[PDB]
Amino acid sequence: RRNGFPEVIYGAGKTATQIVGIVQALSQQTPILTTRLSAEKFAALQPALPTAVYHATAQCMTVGEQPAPKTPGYIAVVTAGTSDQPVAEEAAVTAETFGNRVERVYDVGVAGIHRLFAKLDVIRGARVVIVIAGMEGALASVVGGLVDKPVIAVPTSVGYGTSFQGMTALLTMLNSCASGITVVNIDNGFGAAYSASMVNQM
Amino acid sequence: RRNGFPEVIYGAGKTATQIVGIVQALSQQTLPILTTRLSAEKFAALQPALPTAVYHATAQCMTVGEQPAPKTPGYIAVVTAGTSDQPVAEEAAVTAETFGNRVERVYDVGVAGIHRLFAKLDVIRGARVVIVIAGMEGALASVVGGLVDKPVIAVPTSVGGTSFQGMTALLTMLNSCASGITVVNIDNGFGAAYSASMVNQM
Amino acid sequence: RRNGFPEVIYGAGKTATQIVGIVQALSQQTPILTTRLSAEKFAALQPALPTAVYHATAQCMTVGEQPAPKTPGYIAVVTAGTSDQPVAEEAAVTAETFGNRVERVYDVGVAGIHRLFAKLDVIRGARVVIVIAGMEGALASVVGGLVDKPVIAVPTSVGYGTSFQGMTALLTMLNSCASGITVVNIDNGFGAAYSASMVNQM
Amino acid sequence: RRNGFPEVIYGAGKTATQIVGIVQALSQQTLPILTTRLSAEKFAALQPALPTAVYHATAQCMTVGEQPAPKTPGYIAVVTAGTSDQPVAEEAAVTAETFGNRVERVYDVGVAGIHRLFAKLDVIRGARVVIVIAGMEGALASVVGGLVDKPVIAVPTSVGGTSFQGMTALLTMLNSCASGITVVNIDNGFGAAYSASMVNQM
Amino acid sequence: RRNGFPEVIYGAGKTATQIVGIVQALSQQTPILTTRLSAEKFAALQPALPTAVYHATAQCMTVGEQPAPKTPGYIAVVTAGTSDQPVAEEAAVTAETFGNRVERVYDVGVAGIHRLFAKLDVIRGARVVIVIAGMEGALASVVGGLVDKPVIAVPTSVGYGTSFQGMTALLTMLNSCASGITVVNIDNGFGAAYSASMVNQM
Amino acid sequence: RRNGFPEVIYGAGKTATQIVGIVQALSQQTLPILTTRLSAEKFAALQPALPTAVYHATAQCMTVGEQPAPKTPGYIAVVTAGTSDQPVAEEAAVTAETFGNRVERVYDVGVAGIHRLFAKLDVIRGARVVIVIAGMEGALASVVGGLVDKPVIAVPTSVGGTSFQGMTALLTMLNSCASGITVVNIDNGFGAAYSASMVNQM
Amino acid sequence: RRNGFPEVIYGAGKTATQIVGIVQALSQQTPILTTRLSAEKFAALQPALPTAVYHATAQCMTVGEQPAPKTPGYIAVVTAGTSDQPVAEEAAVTAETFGNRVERVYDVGVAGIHRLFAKLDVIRGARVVIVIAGMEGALASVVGGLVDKPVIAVPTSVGYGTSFQGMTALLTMLNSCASGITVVNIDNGFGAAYSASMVNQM
Amino acid sequence: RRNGFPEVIYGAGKTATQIVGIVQALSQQTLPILTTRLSAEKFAALQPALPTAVYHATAQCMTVGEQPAPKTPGYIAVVTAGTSDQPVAEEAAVTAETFGNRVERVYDVGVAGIHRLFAKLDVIRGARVVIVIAGMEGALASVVGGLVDKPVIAVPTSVGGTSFQGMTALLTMLNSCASGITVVNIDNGFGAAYSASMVNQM
């Protein structure tokens, strides 16, 4: 029960009229984070749940007060390209909603690998690292070889052609777990940040 | 340089006359040497060369060198779905233990006879990290993931068989919902325990 | 001919102007159930066939009188998550239209497995069990091991990423038929309820 | 506990010295013991150990123990598309019979020479349940399913071959339309008959 | 050059403003048939090419005069279900535009196989048979075994789930070519009727 | 009954002692008997039993019985892309000839050295039907299909190899554009010639 | 840094309000080419960046002055069908923006192979050849065998059915690299022209 | 006719008694003869027949005839990801050198230990063309492609293994982003070097 975790509603298939109904049911108990919440659904709820915030790029709403970092360290969220940033903020906002400090390192993909070496120590000073990437997926391989903290890698569905909406990054990423890497499902920013938050709070 | 980890040998693509070559190249470590995926015919080839080495048959791993105490008092729980998983479970198990981790094995607890899984639930919940290894019924990872509030790393196993050579287990674990599961690639129990070991010792 | 079954029009590709034409053709003979009937098509037919009912969540229209249970027992329709409920009501409404009592057990997925043990006897007291699930598909494995009545399992296309719109549940579900489970096609709530109704009426 | 079923041995992953181990562990049942997928070399290994056991060559099943009468007077019809199916058909057949079911075999009736299938249509229609086993021409299940108003369980068989190792038969049976068909996974005649047997004895 | 064939514009990717431009270019020479012509594109061209006809269900426009049957026999176009009829009329209209008599046998799928035996001689009296079907694809197997004229089979992309938009019929159909069957690409009504017309005019 | 065709034996799944069983069951035909896919070790097993039979090594076909004249004066052209195709080309070739067809072989004319293909273009164009057999470079079927105004049946061959075991050739031929091509399934030269033979004799 | 290349913004996922922001950031330095720029996004930017040009068919905007050919030779862009022309102009416009002369040879697909032999010398007089094609993909095979300059082949996603949105051309094209051919990703006109420009400027 | 290239033998499908047949058919060239994919058992079969020939074991290539000087002073760099790549890297290497190219090998520089790759970056950058050969970690091609402003041809290697037999490496290289990469098909180091050699000598 009281395991110290917020509440997570799969806001993708649920109706705006329903999300109020689910929030207002658990509104007396416990922060309430909702993931994959369209901009058309937050507008329809804005006055019905007038405390909630909305992170546009992340498609996440939070009703309630995000805690202060309960752990002295931080989580590195590392992005290969700007197109990755929505699923990145889904991770970074759920990690912050679960009580973790988060240091963002966006747009340092391998096609300009000096950008990643520029922040290479910030990454190393995190307790966990989330690596997000599309197309090639190469970035998680690169970081996994270069840091000695747990790395959770999120493939994304960005790009085109034989990206197979994320399949090629997922395969690339799975093929480098021997370097200290685990992988979540495509676009699953929330899901990597939930295991990330657990790792970080130990 | 010195992150404490033992020396790893990928012994599937190295030769018997070439393994003894790097093992004794680092015979001044005082740190253990773990050799993964070493077929039983290749340990008989070196058994004269390294009389002291230990060989874990099911796990195809050979350890040379004095094991010191566990590094931290928590344990990694290794949960297996069926007997066909025992080998790749034992590769995770032996790697985790060589790396300094206490390991508690919880084998044959697939959801076909789920009472088995509640039998040893106290043990699973007590671990700092849970490695779930499952073949055809990769549904075990989700069942676990929704019963523990600790990190779960899932290892899909290939076992031949509308399981499409384990590809279904990999897909089933990725698409699992007990948020808190994170997936390595097929049969890679080593790398699971490598990420597990980092997670435990933090 | 007179085998005791209603009439089933694949209302997906057929036009609203046509469904009236098909209903009004067989309207003199025999209940008439139509499956995959959009809400935009029922409005266009509401006055042209003003007796029919419409189950919104199920996307099924029935013109005619649903029979009373011709069998003393009931069919358990068991759902893993709320997102599964449309295809669940397609099953539950066709099972009721074919003359079966139906006991619904919705939202008891494995990510909170206590909810399923809460209703575990209701399931067992059914003559047939329909298990519906998305993403992981785990639930059908779990129930198949726990009841000793025929279980028909419907994968659904809900979730995201490597769900492959239902493929991962279908594979998961097919891989547990040795526990007394058969599987229908993705989203095929109607089709599992048609075999279910046959089983139940013996 | 006591659901009446006989004892099942998955004899593909068990060893010859280990099979005689559980068979004689339950030699006080008075109930039959059915051992599926037992290669002809493994029955010669035990033929001394169990002189009374019967072995059904094509079906790779070994039955130890006195078969009592059929439990119910209806029969299961086992329909096979071609000769290449005889083995997995015979695994369904022998399992169904060991479990207490009268079984009527209707073999080699594929739609290439469909007059064969109308030859023995009276027999098929007379069954309480029909198990259809088909390789390349998995179209047989639909043809049957639209000629019988009784439950049909389809078993796709692998036979090597743009049949993609049976995957086409599995897909073809799932996507069948004679509503009333339900599919097990590849080559799993046992589990088909296990669901068939439940359906018959109800 | 003058091989006796009409002109065939892939009207799918081409613009309405362009199709007039392509027609009016070859309008002085030679009938002009255009395939995959949307209803939104024919309206935009109706006054610019005011002689052309439009077959709504077929999405084909013909500018010019369809010839009278230059061959005494006819082509049987055989459809399994009503959902198949668009791609059927794409075949039947291109076969008629190329000078062939066409006898249509729609909706006689295997789920009611008596309907096909009702027309079984009409099919046999054709010089070529086009078999169109979705979902299961079974129908082409059935007819191929029952007629001894060339059968060209068109899979369609109708149905749902693991139809894989036509892939399961294509596979089913390819797996019965030993009965005197060739297969075209999914939905390719025009393409089967072009080989059909050649066969018929010999 | 009597459509003129010779007797066919699928000799891949029949046994050597069982082949001589049906061959001499119909030794009163006066019509030829064609046995396809007969391995060279299985013809040596019967060579005593049938001293008169002919065996075409590359094609794995054995013909017993007096070949009468060709039934019609046109010929079938069998075009092969490379040497690796010679076997399945020769199965089409020998079947077509046993069935009563004049056959002109045009081998090794792949588009890598396309001048070879224009070398024997007069011959190809002169055929009533063209069977194109191609492995990796299945592009040959389209090239032919757009140079002949006669029916083209394409046979994809498996040859191991990012050709995905011939699946690419099958997909490439289906998606060919020289409208006038029709595809059989992988390696099935027999059935190609069976449809070819019907087309030629009409 | 100053390697002589323009600037390339993946204008697909980026917002119109952002592309101005990215252009106007690098507007002081260095031509600026933007690829996959919708017609709805260029209108919204037309007054904010009023120097840029827009190639409608190519979906490319260029802000800045395209250089004159810095190399005396030219690049042949060769198209199989008119449907290929968008991705062709994406290549031809990026090759021209990077300083290359470009000779276009559109619509000479293999279904009318005389059209390609008509321009066969123009192709040969280029220093590099880009071959673009859909459906069959055959054209790259044909040209690769016929020119002895580097050939870069772009599969496209045009056609239907088992085109698998470009997969069949990609496979066909990859299967002819032994003739002096490399392949880029589906629809990647820009990407083949970037390697093409490098080759040409040596 | 005379493009300068040496004579190539595809020695995987040619026989040992047939190889010596064309090698000595062109023994009046004064130009070298390169024989690719020649197993070590097939070179021992000819070693008497051609005493002067050289055989490169790892690369399965045999070269007969006097190598003249390099044709142009630039070199091709052949970069390999791991040891498992050495064979197909060496086929590219030896072909490039036989064709007249200076070749600099840069092996074992995968991104797991990326410092290795910066070790020999000066050499890589100095090449006119870079052939990148990579198995599981096909991410190497992108890393290179974004560090060199010269043409990169990538060769995916099959190595068994959630790498799906190299298919992931092929997909990963296609979907790479360091624009400047171009991909051959699986294991085809020869054809890579054939395109590489053309690119270098221009």
Ligand SMILES: Nc1ncnc2c1ncn2[C@@H]1O[C@H](COP(=O)(O)O)[C@@H](O)[C@H]1O
């Ligand atoms: N964005 C997300 N991705 C994956 N799983 C999620 C996401 N949001 C919530 N979940 C999980 O999905 C389940 C919700 O199931 P449902 O009852 O269908 O809402 C819970 O286990 C949530 O933690």
Ligand SMILES: Nc1ncnc2c1ncn2[C@@H]1O[C@H](COP(=O)(O)O)[C@@H](O)[C@H]1O
């Ligand atoms: N929702 C459904 N899913 C699958 N099959 C269905 C569905 N509704 C009807 N059918 C079956 O599809 C066939 C109707 O074919 P058609 O002539 O195309 O309407 C019949 O066998 C129906 O029982």
Ligand SMILES: Nc1ncnc2c1ncn2[C@@H]1O[C@H](COP(=O)(O)O)[C@@H](O)[C@H]1O
């Ligand atoms: N519906 C269709 N399906 C397949 N191929 C077609 C179709 N309509 C026309 N074609 C062929 O596609 C080619 C037209 O190429 P394009 O120049 O792109 O129009 C010709 O070979 C036509 O015969």
Ligand SMILES: Nc1ncnc2c1ncn2[C@@H]1O[C@H](COP(=O)(O)O)[C@@H](O)[C@H]1O
């Ligand atoms: N049309 C395109 N196709 C593929 N890659 C592209 C395209 N346009 C730009 N790129 C590359 O994609 C990268 C841009 O990454 P991003 O930061 O997400 O814009 C650079 O390497 C560009 O050269």
Ligand SMILES: [Mg+2]
């Ligand atoms: Mg970027």
Ligand SMILES: [Mg+2]
């Ligand atoms: Mg690491």
Ligand SMILES: [Mg+2]
């Ligand atoms: Mg739920």
Ligand SMILES: [Mg+2]
């Ligand atoms: Mg059960």
Ligand SMILES: [Mg+2]
């Ligand atoms: Mg119908």
Ligand SMILES: [Mg+2]
């Ligand atoms: Mg036929």
Ligand SMILES: [Mg+2]
């Ligand atoms: Mg064209």
Ligand SMILES: [Mg+2]
């Ligand atoms: Mg070339």
